[PDB]
Write an enzyme that holds these catalytic residues in place. Structure first.
Site, PDB file in Angstrom:
ATOM      1  CB  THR A   1       8.205  16.200  24.981  1.00  0.00           C
ATOM      2  OG1 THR A   1       8.259  15.043  25.833  1.00  0.00           O
ATOM      3  CG2 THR A   1       9.490  16.966  25.086  1.00  0.00           C
ATOM      4  CB  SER A   2       3.586  15.816  22.226  1.00  0.00           C
ATOM      5  OG  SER A   2       3.057  17.126  22.319  1.00  0.00           O
TER       6      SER A   2
ATOM      7  CG  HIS B   1       5.854  13.602  30.493  1.00  0.00           C
ATOM      8  ND1 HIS B   1       6.971  13.003  29.952  1.00  0.00           N
ATOM      9  CD2 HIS B   1       5.331  14.370  29.510  1.00  0.00           C
ATOM     10  CE1 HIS B   1       7.117  13.393  28.698  1.00  0.00           C
ATOM     11  NE2 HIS B   1       6.141  14.231  28.408  1.00  0.00           N
ATOM     12  N   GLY B   2       6.035  11.458  34.283  1.00  0.00           N
ATOM     13  CA  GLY B   2       6.067  11.269  35.719  1.00  0.00           C
ATOM     14  C   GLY B   2       7.457  11.422  36.289  1.00  0.00           C
TER      15      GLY B   2
ATOM     16  CB  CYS C   1       9.796   9.038  33.767  1.00  0.00           C
ATOM     17  SG  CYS C   1      10.224   8.776  32.036  1.00  0.00           S
TER      18      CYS C   1
END
Ligand code: NA
Ligand code: NA
EC number: 3.4.22.56
Lengths: 4, 240, 240, 4
Positions: C34-35, C93-94, C135
């Site tokens: 997701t953006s 993100h992660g 994350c």
């Protein structure tokens, strides 16, 4: 010296 | 009264708290784990160091994985209401995320979960310190020449070594990390905030120690400890 | 001259150093990611905050995994001799150990390895700060009501969240962690040592933020950041 | 509020  | 500040943990409860030292030296033969010569030097140094900080020290030796879990569970179910903090020191073999009982491994997350803010209510909001002398893998450092709160809040993990790395123990002198930790607590606990004491431990281990081995793979290696802080306030072992 | 002390990093080189901000908002459709609405607020806040600390800020947006690795490699091969420190901020993100390029993951260990004491000699002995808003897994915190040196030495990882946990980002206000980090740097960088600034960030995130969601699984959740320090000295952004 |  020794490692754990 | 006058203006007040609340940037430091309250450390003037009637008791500083428990210091549980788990000292695993001898392992069951079927595990194949070597005896940890020098660890008794560490355990005695820690007992004296935390005694002088006014912790109620309990030393436990050669615990099975079952005994480690039951000890931690039982301690987490005590009434800590009159205690400022909690300290647990683990001296054993390890790998990333794991410390060894005498007969097999214990997940560090299982141990520390007992003290979560929602599971040990008499330690909610109080610093919970886990000090770990154990390997975290098998890498060697070759060196270079020169309202609610989160249930995971208020934990500090003082690891002897970087993630993925071996940790070094001298059979005569004790482990590099515990030797250094006790020395810095003895010198600075009446002077410095705990993160700054641990930073001096980092420097002492990183600069003063280097391995000596007849085995080239293990010779001339270095170590850096790791401070893992989820604390929300400054921690001073003294109070005014 | 008179007695001297050497407990703090030298921060009076001609330049404070680089601040590289990698701001990944939009991801390739095939990844399904997701953006990250709100991340531009974070990137602008960081740029201004580190500008006022006199860092040479470079903002990079929507980098592929290949571009992230090449950027970090190239930066590690610059001459940092006149720079006091190095800062890298990752917004993406992660998962545990990973941050995402726009087209796939990058190992955090690969990124940071470029700056090892033996691989970036002009940063040896200087603080290398990695600030990570990403994350680290999918757990949610329900909260509770109230001589040589090691090649891994002199790194600090300021993680937005505990290992294994999601990290929270508000689409209007930016991420809880970066909002709080910039606020505490603005207020205390001329006053407090960096570990103590980050401890105030821990407290701000832990106490002032709680998620709101129409989805019960994601509602009323809490977050605690994690300070991961292998520093060997105190870090002040000012000098005398 | 969104997760990363
Ligand atoms: Na050690
Ligand atoms: Na955050």
């Amino acid at each position: 010296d020794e490692v754990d | 009264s006058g203006i007040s500040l609340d940037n430091s943990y309250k450390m003037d409860y009637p008791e500083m708290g428990l210091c549980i030292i788990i000292n695993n030296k001898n392992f069951h033969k079927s595990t194949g784990m070597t005896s940890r010569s020098g660890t008794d030097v560490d355990a005695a140094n820690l007992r004296e160091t935390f005694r002088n900080l006014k912790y109620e020290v309990r030393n436990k030796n050669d615990l099975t994985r079952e005994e480690i879990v039951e000890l931690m569970r039982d301690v987490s179910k005590e009434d800590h209401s009159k205690r400022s903090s909690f300290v647990c020191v683990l001296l054993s073999h390890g790998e990333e995320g794991i410390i060894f009982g005498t007969n097999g491994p214990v997940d560090l997350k299982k141990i520390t979960n007992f003290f979560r803010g929602d599971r040990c209510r008499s330690l909610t909001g109080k610093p919970k310190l886990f000090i770990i002398q154990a390997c975290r893998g098998t890498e060697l450092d070759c060196g270079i020449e020169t309202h609610k709160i989160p249930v995971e809040a208020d934990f500090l993990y003082a690891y002897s070594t970087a993630p993925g790395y071996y940790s070094w123990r001298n059979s005569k002198d004790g482990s590099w990390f515990i030797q250094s930790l006790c020395a810095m607590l003895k010198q600075y606990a009446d002077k410095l905030e705990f993160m700054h004491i641990l930073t001096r431990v980092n420097r002492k281990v990183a600069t003063e120690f280097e391995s000596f081995s007849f085995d080239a793979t293990f010779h001339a290696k270095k170590q850096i400890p790791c401070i893992y802080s989820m604390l929300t306030k400054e921690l001073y072992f003294y109070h005014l």
